[PDB]
Design a protein around this ligand. Sequence first.
Ligand SMILES: NC(=O)C1=CN([C@@H]2O[C@H](COP(=O)(O)OP(=O)(O)OC[C@H]3O[C@@H](n4cnc5c(N)ncnc54)[C@H](O)[C@@H]3OP(=O)(O)O)[C@@H](O)[C@H]2O)C=CC1
Ligand SMILES: [Ca+2]
Length: 358
Amino acid sequence: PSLRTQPSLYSGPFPFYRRPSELGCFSLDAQRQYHGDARALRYYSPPPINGPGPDFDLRDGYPDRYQPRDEEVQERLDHLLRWVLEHRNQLEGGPGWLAGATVTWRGHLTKLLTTPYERQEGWQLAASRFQGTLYLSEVETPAARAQRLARPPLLRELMYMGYKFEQYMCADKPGGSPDPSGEVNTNVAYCSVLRSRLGNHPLLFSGEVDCLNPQAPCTQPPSCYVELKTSKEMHSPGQWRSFYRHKLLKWWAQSFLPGVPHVVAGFRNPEGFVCSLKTFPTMEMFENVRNDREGWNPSVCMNFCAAFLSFAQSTVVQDDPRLVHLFSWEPGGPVTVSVHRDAPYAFLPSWYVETMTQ
Ligand SMILES: NC(=O)C1=CN([C@@H]2O[C@H](COP(=O)(O)OP(=O)(O)OC[C@H]3O[C@@H](n4cnc5c(N)ncnc54)[C@H](O)[C@@H]3OP(=O)(O)O)[C@@H](O)[C@H]2O)C=CC1
Ligand SMILES: [Ca+2]
């Protein structure tokens, strides 16, 4: 049993994808504690239109005011399971909606979406069915774990710079003012919880959300949300073309899933300064590669993802939170499956399983 990943198998019409609704949200504070409210949400606050072009120093505060998340901690789905536990009765969609849903993080779905074009990084997804519901939780691959432990100084600082850019672009209160003098603490996160459906696969997933734009004409989430990105300044048309083809595909996939309609990008020069901003509407990103022989195709992304969901659903027949079907994929190969029980792959915690059982 395996699943091919070549884009030519998936090039048909765009599949059904339900307009996403936000079911709720949660926050993680500076100590990585869960709170079932929006306390971590920040508000889009771009530089005044009448003032100077941005000149954000993305290195300011590195590493002295940097409080990085401890990446050795395996959170898996735990934060999302807690939200689900705390909202299990008052869920949308009617009786047994959760039982026919697939539950995962937005970022796991993003990786599925980009799989047909991905040439470098493989993945592993653990799958457990429990009370009908299919749960998907990423497993760090061996190469990804070594690459992580040996992360160049450069990539460590780039990651800080992405977060620092958000600090320059966001305020703690609507219409408030940004505060770059503060600490960059990546334990802090605001997460949106959404309902969608791909083909006939109902979806419940959560994703980190950078800010809410109080100037957006539609105030209903997720339409009022904005995604913040940084990227190298580009000069030649070849450089923009490469950007469109590789980077935009990932930006698209990440923001398309939860219905986040705009990505705001800060382009940074080699000295670490953002000295321009560009807005990319999620629904127009594909326009940049529509008639490009080397471009990507949203239909391919979504049809492969729908096909992977059908594959997972039909492969994972046993209802058992301690059993795991591990889906493995490396560039140039098909998705394959192995089966495992209990430690280390089993990822549904007892505090979830026991409460859901009662
Ligand atoms: N393989 C894993 O263990 C994963 C854990 N997660 C966790 O689950 C929750 C949902 O995250 P997501 O599904 O929104 O994740 P993704 O879309 O992959 O990333 C969105 C943002 O989440 C942040 N983020 C996500 N993962 C990490 C990380 N490992 N270390 C530090 N920051 C992280 C980051 O701001 C990133 O923004 P950029 O795409 O601009 O880098 C978060 O609390 C996240 O920590 C997510 C994906 C994969
Ligand atoms: Ca971001």
